[PDB]
Design a protein around this ligand. Sequence first.
Ligand SMILES: [Fe+3]
Ligand SMILES: [Fe+3]
Ligand SMILES: [Fe+3]
Ligand SMILES: [Fe+3]
Ligand SMILES: [Fe+3]
Ligand SMILES: [Fe+3]
Lengths: 170, 170
Amino acid sequence: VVKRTMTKKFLEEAFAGESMAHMRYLIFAEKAEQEGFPNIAKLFRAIAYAEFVHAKNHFIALGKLGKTPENLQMGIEGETFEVEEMYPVYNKAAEFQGEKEAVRTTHYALEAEKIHAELYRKAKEKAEKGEDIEIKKVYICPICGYTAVDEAPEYCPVCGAPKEKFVVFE
Amino acid sequence: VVKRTMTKKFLEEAFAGESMAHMRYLIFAEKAEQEGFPNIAKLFRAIAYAEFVHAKNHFIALGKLGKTPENLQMGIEGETFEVEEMYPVYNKAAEFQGEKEAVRTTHYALEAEKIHAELYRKAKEKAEKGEDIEIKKVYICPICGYTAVDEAPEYCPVCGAPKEKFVVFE
Ligand SMILES: [Fe+3]
Ligand SMILES: [Fe+3]
Ligand SMILES: [Fe+3]
Ligand SMILES: [Fe+3]
Ligand SMILES: [Fe+3]
Ligand SMILES: [Fe+3]
C-alpha cells in the first residue's frame, strides 16, 4: 500500500486518468464500428483493456481492492453519494444555467444510480453470508442506463426506449 | 453542446466519476468471479455497462466525440501527454518517495503508453485516407498492459510474463 501523500495523490489522478482513457477508447471503438472501421474499433477496445490493466494496478497499489462484500460497500457509497449529493446538485445547476442536455444526462444517471444503490445493498446482504446472489438476467437501457434485474418493464420508465433495445447480461 | 463554464466543469467531473465507477466495477467483477460469486460478478459487469452509457451521454453532451480521425488524434494526445509529462514525473516522484509499488505501476503504464501513442499515430494515417487498418490480432499483457499487434513476443519485455498469458482481441 502506497503510504506517502504525494504518491497516493498521483496514483489517484492516474487511476482517474486511466479510467477516462478506457472510457474514451470504448466510446471511440463504438464510433469506429459505426463509421465502417471494424479493425480500428478492435484496436481501441484492446487498448481499453490495457488501460483497465493499468487502472487496476494503480487501484491495488492504493490498497483500495477488498473482498466482495467490501467492494459492494464501496459501490453502495459511491452510488448513494451520486444520488444524494452529486447528481441532484449537478442537475439543479444545469437547469439553473439553461443547459437542457446537461439536465437530460444528469437526470438519466441520477435515476439509474438510485437503482444501482438498491441492488448493491441487496447483493451485499447475500455476499455478507458467503452466498452468491441468484439472478438470470440484467437489462440495461442503452440510452439512459436504467437497470433492471430478471424482469424489466416493456418500455424504459426513464426515456421510453422499448425493451427490445435493452442490453442483456446473462 | 454544453457552453456555460460551470455546467461544463460539472459534466467533466461527472464523466471522470462515471469513468471511475465503470472501472471500479470491472475490477470488482473480476474479484467477485475470483471468490466464487459469478452472479455478483455479472451484476457488476452489467452496472459497469450502465455507467459506460452515462459517461458516453456526458461526453457527447460536452461535444467531445468526433469522427474516428479526430478520436485517434484525441488518443495520440492523451498518450503523448502521458509518455512525456505525466508518467515520467509520477514515476520519478514515487522513486523520490521510495514507493516501490507506485514505481512499478507507473513504469508498467509508461512503457505501454509509448506503444499506444505509436499505434494510434499509424491508425490515423490510415483513417485520414478513408481506410481501415489491416490487422488481425492485438495482444495485451494482463499484468502490465504491454501491447503488441499481429505478433506476440515469446515473453513480455516489461514484466517478463509468458506470451501464453496475453489476452487476444481478434
Ligand atoms: Fe494506460
Ligand atoms: Fe451507478
Ligand atoms: Fe432508458
Ligand atoms: Fe452512472
Ligand atoms: Fe494508453
Ligand atoms: Fe507484461
